[PDB]
Symmetry: D3
Subunit: 329 residues, 6 copies
């Protein structure tokens, strides 16, 4: 039916390759809605998909992806019509099914999110999965008591994907943001995203940890897990909460029971991969209103092309990239 | 200005009093609202307030408490009138200031909750902090997605104060409850409190640990923290949550980030001590309707009586109480 | 088109007499929707409309009424349809426009309420205005914070039209109701309406009058008004409310500012004559559910024919009816 | 420790003094949160707590106050955290327990409200009791129908603490505000604050009482009380409301039942002292959005230090203040 | 009392004439509230009223209208006070009872809506009945799904009154509007109103009709309904709706059933004549905020005077009007 | 893996066959969630999918289906765990994708709905699609004004799955239901399902056609609309609503615009195939509460088994099936 470029990862023995192959429309999962991808996605999980030892993908070959945002061309699904702008993120995409890093994508109607009126196709990808994860985290924390005045809100691993955006959204909602990173010299760019304060990894965790510490924060959007979350928990304000998104040193969390039962703190698991659609559609409205930051264009490091995509996959992973990479198809 | 039987704790030497003395109204702290207690409990926290330095009471002649319900006799407080029935619970009662359990108590107006309409004073102290802790637990899990079709809800430490009632409230709300205990024998009592099933402590955790296990429960009310809690977070279904309220079974929780960030589960700290007035009111309101189980009295391991107090302040501390013990006066 | 009987009020020099004549539907008002009236409406305001010096009817041949319920026979306005069961009450009915002591009445569609599903036509007029007044007072009191548990509710002139139903509506709701009247045999009649205790007119005013008194109530449904309002206002609990409605008891009310400003009580005027259609229908709804008292028919003193109506229009007024007289057309 | 400068009132047998005395932390009651006061406040109630036989201060050396905004500085209340910004108002402050006309105070935790995000500490006190009372008035009126289109709203006592502010709140929401005052001269000022029309005292009450006058406001905010409020009551549109809060120009209100029963009007009591935490905190949120007037600094008569306060508590009384008097620490 | 001007329609033996007559307030229906009309309104249903065989006005005397907005001059009706601004529209006005084209109208207090705060009288009548019909139409779409992301919205008959206001309002909500009218270059005016796109009659419907077409829209506001409308229903996104309010394109609609049962589209009937006060007032609120377009006054063709009203009543009736003609008085 | 029985449509030659078969697990679509099916019906759509030129199934060797209520036997998708009861209906099941006339099915997760707490797998299926479709018809009517009280409500085709059910359900909500059929001598079946009046099709249409008819209903659930719906549309009360859904009756609906623009009635299309998971889950919630009629199983004509299944497939079509037919598995 029509030929185009895609970014296809594949295994020869023990080893993951990744190159822009040229592919026909008839080859795609037939059974989704046919999308022409406007924009992009380069995400940490895509990098892992692209590399042996990543533990994301299980049979190759597979077109890489996880995030895409384009226009419906061809529907068999009455819910969607030609011309509709949609976002196709999460679920199986980019993991066990053809993904977004490609002109054209077939994805199930039941994962399409109708593009919010006040985000363009490219703003939707400046956001992507990180970004959704961030917005998701402020939504969960908000339904557990968070409000801009119960005190100051902590973003760990700011600077990374999720953290960088959460900094900005919190800041558009009017919370006081404290961002922590290991990289000095990131202070300026975190402030421009909205942080009114910048602290170190070490200001959040040092020598191990106790059950309860002086109250410092109220809540945290937390993309980094491990011993450091354990710590932070004990510095969270009464009734406060924490939203976890990542591992980044520490699958283990040696936590106590104390911040929980004495200070009423909650820890909210956040997974964007299977979030159900209604909540998904609601978080996206938000990301285009309530939570749409004034920078935003500032969180983009580079807009690269489908061609230039193997190299940018090698660059997150080797974290040589501040902010976000969108791909323009 | 009469005289009455409070229960008082003294540090004589270093081994801690617990004796049914006799006190003056003028000795009550003259800044409260005087209430004539009809009833009380008998909560674990009350047991430790009574032991050999159990890390609750730090100043030293003290009337034990935390739970009381009775009638205003005298208020300097525009907001309560003589004759009002009230509940007085939490906050400093029975920890840094004189407590329930003592016909006569002088509680600030701020901590008082009017007795809701469908609950008698006996019902109120049959619930106690134990039943307000379990109620706030359900209240809390409900704000995080909890719902009875979602799948069964585990109540851990069932039998105890908090678990015993949690099983009831769960069952009243129509969920399928799954109760754990340390003893065989329980079972019929748990089945008739509302359990639709009884499993042992080892079926929750003996296995010791594992990042993710098979999904078994929509969520849990867990009054028994410890390793046991770290194990159950791994058996919670997707977007499920767990409400920790107590410490039985250990301070430490060795958790992994992985049910949080891959399964979207949440873990919610439940503290009944400083919960805000509105939510306290709201939770009593539910406790008298919504969560009011038809058993109710079933949770009573007979009523006791002031003089009779040392006795139970003793059992508690060695779970030889099955459910709860109120105090008439 | 038809003849029918109505109870009409005639004046000449200056007596005003009230006889059942025979009208035709052709000399009903032609603008309104035509309605076969089923039941009643004997009210104290009709007694007044009936009598020189009543100061109710402005101008004089006029069919007495104010309340009516029946079935739309012939509508020239889309909103109502031959068959529809509907209530007609207040506004101009029975005051400056032909009312419903008549079988047939021509009312504007703007003023009919559809008959609630769980309330028959007889029940609607068993309530009437005196009912709708009482339900409104409850509705206005609850918007100002009233709730079954903030302390007892007083109903003055219980036995009256309004205090009767009000006593039963509050009790249907759960509130502890305390009723006051002038007569000493009414105790049981009033228990039997739902009163929890019964008190003299003097138990509320005797004492004549202090700025602030011992708090006793929470709030009141008051159809009596007068100096006794001024006293009742000062026995209201913190933030309680009172609903006014009548003056059977005086018009001057020597209030002082102290209960309002130091204790946050409020005085709500109930007028049903001009109450907005949206609230009218909300209250009729409550009147057919959550305010519908089990007792209800036990407030009917006597059904009467149109024939016996002059009979009874002299009987309210002569204040010799206990409860409500309903008229079957 | 350290030491700091309070404005303490003392009784010299009958003299009742008030002097800037130096006390120590160690002095302040020992059960609250230690707060460093930043700002002010001079209310009329505070003049009184100064003046002998003013009838407000209980027994009699205490630090005057009633209002304070400032910083939690250490706490044994888990609810608050060194650092947090808070507002301390009402309840016993500055009446039976030390107030905030002083650097340092110890308020209990249950009375503290977290400073809203879009108010500074100084803006908190620019309002004070006066402004909380204004905004609680509006909030209760709006709870009883008031809406900006249902006609003009009167505010009596404009140029006082409460009236002044209320004008500009009422205007901030879009109401058409009619402001009344005792002295000419102030029209310009009242309009800057956002009054649409300025009338005198005699325009409200000159003519002196009648039971129903010609309809003229919809509703009022009323600082003033006595027979004026009686007059003005008979001038309120169908279904409108008046909220009273002061007793300037008399504690007695010679009302009639007739605006209430015939026009459906309500009169609501505003107590600021003990209004519950709930509404208190919802009302301060409104005072930072919704009710935050663009002027707001226009109301500030001057800013004053702790020493010139003694001057100020004598001025507040026998009227001299136009607007509000802010104390800085 | 007074003499004033009014565009009255007379019919003698056979014709329907229409001119400015002098009339006196002693002739205006004696039952409703008296209003000194400030404005308008030229509606199509107005043209039919003042036209031989137009078949609206049943009986001639009458003074034409359907819309007006003005200032209460005197009232017997407690709900209205000499001075209020109000809008008076629909019900029997300009159809079977004296309407709004005059100084002076007498309208039943049950039909006045008070002017919302953000609408001047002029603006209320720029909108008028046809204006109210657009808001009401969107309001009902929005009750059936319609939301801006979900696709673009069509507006037939753009160019008239209803369609042109519909186009603005939808745009101010941020819909993508597709305005469709047959007056060909008119094009840029539809663009001043907020249309994103502009198509013609043939592109809605041409020759023919098919049960389902290619999906194109999502929703339509439809003042033109007829064969053109069966055509449009086959063209609407899954779960869309159309809000019909007019013939124009004629009154038969041969529709299938497939868009309804297969595609879940809905068709909403819009009547602004008898819509309840309730919704009416909610919709005038929207009109005055939410749905209030920036280029309101760009819909005003011309502002005529009562004199030059006869010419304009000809003018609608034949596609001579681009927008609306307002009348000033 | 294991193997099992299922009813399967093949088209050997050109005739379309339908026999019970032995399939294997390994032969189910392998990305769905694996449900062991407990029950199925029986829908018209299921009659057609297994009759040539029936025109539902486009590609044959399908498992027929469309409804299924089952148990997660093990899943690849983290949002379901084994033992979860679930309902699987609509979307592609049994039109495009193997359906529930099988023991065993592999429904994708996105389409599953947890079985509600107060329904049994048997119940879910007593309901199935046509049932869901009645449920959703009520949901939508209720979204458009339908309340018990606004008059009585029709249900055409009162004998099949959808209409039979909508009758029991409407009446469960308190509506005065009118049932219409052309099967005289069924009167009792209906009244027993809850019809309060029964009438012949001829009563609804017959009379051939007219634009505005005497108003008889308020609304109609119409499962059988066509030229009769057009008639019906002319007899709905002001603001009334009709819910479509079906098609015997003809697909052609030659309507007018007049019930729509003069009486403000509405046509709402009902489609159960693609309704969002959202609304769909919440409709299932009603179906087990709000709309769960006492009758229910009174609508099971008979419980059949897989074998008997082909004959049932043949029996719907010629109306020999009065209620609904379930299928044990």
């Amino acid at each position: 039916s029509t030929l185009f470029q895609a970014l296809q990862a594949e295994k020869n023995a023990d080893d993951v390759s990744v190159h822009v192959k040229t592919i026909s429309t008839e080859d795609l999962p037939k059974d989704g809605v046919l999308i022409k991808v406007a924009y992009s996605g380069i995400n940490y999980k895509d990098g892992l998909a692209g590399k042996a030892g990543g533990n994301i993908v299980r049979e190759y070959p597979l077109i890489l992806g996880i995030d895409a945002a384009g226009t419906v061309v061809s529907s068999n699904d009455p819910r969607f019509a030609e011309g509709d702008e949609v976002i196709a993120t999460s679920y199986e995409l980019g993991v066990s099914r053809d993904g977004g890093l490609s002109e054209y994508a077939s994805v199930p109607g039941d994962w399409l999110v109708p593009l919010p009126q006040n985000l363009s196709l490219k703003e939707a990808m400046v956001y992507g999965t990180a970004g959704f994860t961030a917005a998701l985290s402020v939504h969960r924390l908000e339904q557990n008591g968070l409000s801009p005045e119960k005190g100051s809100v902590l973003v760990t691993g700011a600077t990374g994907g999720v953290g960088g955006i959460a900094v900005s959204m919190l800041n558009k909602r009017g919370y006081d943001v404290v961002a922590s990173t290991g990289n000095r010299e990131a202070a300026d760019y975190l402030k421009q995203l909205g942080a009114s304060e910048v602290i170190s990894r070490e200001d959040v965790y040092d020598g191990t940890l106790k059950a309860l510490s002086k109250q410092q924060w109220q809540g945290a959007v937390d993309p980094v897990g491990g011993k450091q979350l354990a710590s932070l928990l004990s510095k969270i304000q009464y009734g406060g909460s924490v939203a976890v998104s990542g591992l980044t040193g520490g699958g283990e969390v040696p936590a106590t029971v104390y911040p929980f039962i004495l200070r009423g703190v909650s820890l909210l698991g956040i997974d964007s991969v299977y979030c159900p659609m209604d909540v998904r559609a609601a978080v996206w409205e938000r990301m285009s209103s309530d939570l749409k930051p004034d920078q935003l264009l500032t969180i983009v490091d580079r807009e690269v092309s489908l061609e230039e995509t193997p190299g940018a996959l090698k660059d997150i992973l080797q974290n040589r990239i501040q902010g976000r990479v969108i791909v323009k198809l």
